[PDB]
Design a protein around this ligand. Sequence first.
Ligand SMILES: CC(C)C[C@H](NC(=O)c1cc(C(=O)N[C@H](C)c2ccccc2)cc(N(C)S(C)(=O)=O)c1)[C@@H](O)C[C@@H](C)C(=O)N[C@H](C(=O)NC(C)C)C(C)C
Length: 389
Amino acid sequence: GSFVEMVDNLRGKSGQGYYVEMTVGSPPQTLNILVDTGSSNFAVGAAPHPFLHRYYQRQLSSTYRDLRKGVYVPYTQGKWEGELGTDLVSIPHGPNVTVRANIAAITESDKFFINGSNWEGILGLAYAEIARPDDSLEPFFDSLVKQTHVPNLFSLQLCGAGFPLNQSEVLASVGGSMIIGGIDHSLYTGSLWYTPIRREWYYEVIIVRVEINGQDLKMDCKEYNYDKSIVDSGTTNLRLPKKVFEAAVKSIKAASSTEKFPDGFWLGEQLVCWQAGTTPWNIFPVISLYLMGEVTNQSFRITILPQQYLRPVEDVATSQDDCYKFAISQSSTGTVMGAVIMEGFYVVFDRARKRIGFAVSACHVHDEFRTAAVEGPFVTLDMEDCGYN
Ligand SMILES: CC(C)C[C@H](NC(=O)c1cc(C(=O)N[C@H](C)c2ccccc2)cc(N(C)S(C)(=O)=O)c1)[C@@H](O)C[C@@H](C)C(=O)N[C@H](C(=O)NC(C)C)C(C)C
């Protein structure tokens, strides 16, 4: 697995989302697109907007096709309306190919475009099933596979920094790698463990057990996937179902009790600060999620450090002071494994073998005493009961 050409093709190391460069139309209009495995719609800005440095101009593409049909897409945070149509797409730092894909020209949007993010579109990599209007709208990756020889899987390495990067730093620095059609062994260390995609709509998985510094949260596993558990590059936080969230924060609060933090912090609202270089990483617990394996009654665990769940935010008063935000939050829509998780590993979306694999990221942030981890197997039974129906 050597796609050294696609290696380092991502951006927004310490920004608002990881994007890849793409081009749409003829002649090629360049646009940075947010990699989002939590949805299935390919959409781009198509009209000027305040937080848009550039956008898709249909009238200038010789290959554009207006489907004369509107589309509406609502996300946990933000939404947009647009006009459906198709055009030719390319990924400069992806496989050398061109495919005709469905494209939503965003005309009306609300709390979607993040000012300064530097991305003008979104690449929904999930399955047709959750695509809008309905599943008849072939998602991008599906078009890519049907129209070429590119293998049916992709890999993601999202690189966090551990420290805040200013405007020009997020621009001139690798944010990670999105390997389309294969795996690059250089992106990870150790072994790759695969968990089954329960059902092909979101990239759904099943969590069988959660630990806070080795201590079992000991709750009925169904709770851990209450509604569902998905993997989403487009979500910042490790989002957890209300009940699981309350329990985790209680345990995290107990593990770090030698220091007190204002309630707002645990809500992810107010940031906590320490003298530059004095962040007490050791007082915070590591967090482990156990996922079902391909082998029956067997499972493995992925473990993250506070360096993954304590996000670096630039302090108002420039003070060298290192500041963070608790990036573990509540969800009424199931567990969401966002960047907090993905930034710790190399994740393989083996759509072809209907599975997702994890391995310690060659770029995850850590200290000299602890590191992210992926280990197995563990003999736990009746794990089918974990799934929500
Ligand atoms: C571009 C997004 C607008 C896409 C959706 N992102 C969200 O909604 C969302 C984005 C961010 C956020 O800051 N991300 C940045 C870019 C980011 C991402 C990664 C690293 C750094 C920064 C935070 C949250 N918070 C909850 S947080 C505070 O992290 O706890 C949520 C999608 O990735 C989510 C996805 C699950 C869905 O909404 N899918 C749709 C869906 O089911 N909709 C139902 C109907 C609500 C789809 C299938 C139709």
